[PDB]
Structure formats: structure tokens, C-alpha cells
mmCIF file of C-alpha atoms in Angstrom:
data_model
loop_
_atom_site.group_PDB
_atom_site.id
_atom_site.type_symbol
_atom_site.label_atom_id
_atom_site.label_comp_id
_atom_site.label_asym_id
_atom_site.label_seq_id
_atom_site.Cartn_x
_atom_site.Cartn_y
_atom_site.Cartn_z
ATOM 1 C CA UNK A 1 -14.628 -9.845 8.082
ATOM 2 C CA UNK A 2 -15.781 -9.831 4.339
ATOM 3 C CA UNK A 3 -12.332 -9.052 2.693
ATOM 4 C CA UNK A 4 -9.548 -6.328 3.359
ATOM 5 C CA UNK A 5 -7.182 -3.885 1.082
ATOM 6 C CA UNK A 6 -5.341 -5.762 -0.957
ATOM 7 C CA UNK A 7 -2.723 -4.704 -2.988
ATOM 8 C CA UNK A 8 -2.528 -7.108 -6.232
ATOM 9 C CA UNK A 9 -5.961 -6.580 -7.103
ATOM 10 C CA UNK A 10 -5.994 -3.396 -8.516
ATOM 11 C CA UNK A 11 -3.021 -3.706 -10.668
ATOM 12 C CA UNK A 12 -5.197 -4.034 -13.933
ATOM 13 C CA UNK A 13 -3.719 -1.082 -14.176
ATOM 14 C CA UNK A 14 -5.854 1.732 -14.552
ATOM 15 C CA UNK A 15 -4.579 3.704 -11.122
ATOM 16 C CA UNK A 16 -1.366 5.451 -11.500
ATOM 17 C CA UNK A 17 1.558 4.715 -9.205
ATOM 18 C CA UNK A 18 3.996 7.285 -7.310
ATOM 19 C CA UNK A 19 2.596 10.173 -6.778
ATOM 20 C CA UNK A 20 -1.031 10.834 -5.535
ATOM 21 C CA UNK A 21 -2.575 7.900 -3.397
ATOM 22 C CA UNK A 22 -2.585 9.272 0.002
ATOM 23 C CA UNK A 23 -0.238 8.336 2.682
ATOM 24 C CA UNK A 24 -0.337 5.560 5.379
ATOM 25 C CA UNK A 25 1.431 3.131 8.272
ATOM 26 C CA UNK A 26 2.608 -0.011 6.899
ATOM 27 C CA UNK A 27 3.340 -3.035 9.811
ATOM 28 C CA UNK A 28 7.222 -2.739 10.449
ATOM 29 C CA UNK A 29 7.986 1.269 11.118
ATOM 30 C CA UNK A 30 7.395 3.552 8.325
ATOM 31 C CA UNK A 31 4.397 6.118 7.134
ATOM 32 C CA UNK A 32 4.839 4.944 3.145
ATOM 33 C CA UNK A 33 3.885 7.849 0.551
ATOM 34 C CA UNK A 34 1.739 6.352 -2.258
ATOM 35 C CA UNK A 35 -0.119 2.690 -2.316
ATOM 36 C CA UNK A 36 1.712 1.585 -5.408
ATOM 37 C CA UNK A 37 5.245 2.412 -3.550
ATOM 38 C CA UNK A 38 3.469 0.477 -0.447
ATOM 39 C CA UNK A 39 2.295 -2.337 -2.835
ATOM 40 C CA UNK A 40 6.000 -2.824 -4.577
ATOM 41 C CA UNK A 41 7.558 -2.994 -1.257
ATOM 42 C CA UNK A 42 4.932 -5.582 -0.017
ATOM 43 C CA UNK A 43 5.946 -8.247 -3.196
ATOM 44 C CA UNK A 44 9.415 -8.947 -1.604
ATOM 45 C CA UNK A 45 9.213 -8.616 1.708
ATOM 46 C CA UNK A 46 8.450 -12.382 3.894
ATOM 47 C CA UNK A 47 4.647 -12.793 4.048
ATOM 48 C CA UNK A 48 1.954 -10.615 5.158
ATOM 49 C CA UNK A 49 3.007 -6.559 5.659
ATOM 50 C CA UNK A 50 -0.160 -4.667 5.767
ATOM 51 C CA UNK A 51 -1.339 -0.924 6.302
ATOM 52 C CA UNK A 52 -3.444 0.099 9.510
ATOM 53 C CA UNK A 53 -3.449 3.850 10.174
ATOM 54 C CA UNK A 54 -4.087 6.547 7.713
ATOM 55 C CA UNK A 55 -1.255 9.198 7.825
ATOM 56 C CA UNK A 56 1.260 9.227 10.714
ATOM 57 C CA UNK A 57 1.445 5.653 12.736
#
């Protein structure tokens, strides 16, 4: 595979969360806005909740 987007890894900061970081499908029902609002979500949810289409699911 070598690797996939994950979300922890750019929290150095230095990329600045809710407003521009275009839009996507996260795995349970939902287009999510920005990849910091995505990446929040992901922390609490069960184990393993990732993004596969860009825009609209």
C-alpha cells in the first residue's frame, strides 16, 4: 500500500482547522466540511472511521 491519510500526523500544528480544507465522505453517512472537523470527530468515535470520496459520497 505504502501508507494512507492519516489524521494525527499533521497536528504539529502548522495547518489551520475549520474552515478551508476541502470537503469529503467519511465511512458512516456524512460529506464532513474541513479535515480538522473530520480529524476531531475521528478521536472518539470506536476504531477506524476513514475518508474515501472527495466531495459528495
Amino acid at each position: 500500500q505504502g501508507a494512507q491519510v492519516d489524521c494525527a500526523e499533521f497536528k504539529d500544528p502548522k495547518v489551520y482547522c475549520t474552515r478551508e480544507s476541502n470537503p469529503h465522505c467519511g465511512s458512516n453517512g456524512e460529506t464532513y466540511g474541513n479535515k480538522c472537523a473530520f480529524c476531531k470527530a475521528v478521536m472518539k468515535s470506536g476504531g477506524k472511521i476513514n475518508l474515501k470520496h472527495r466531495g459528495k459520497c
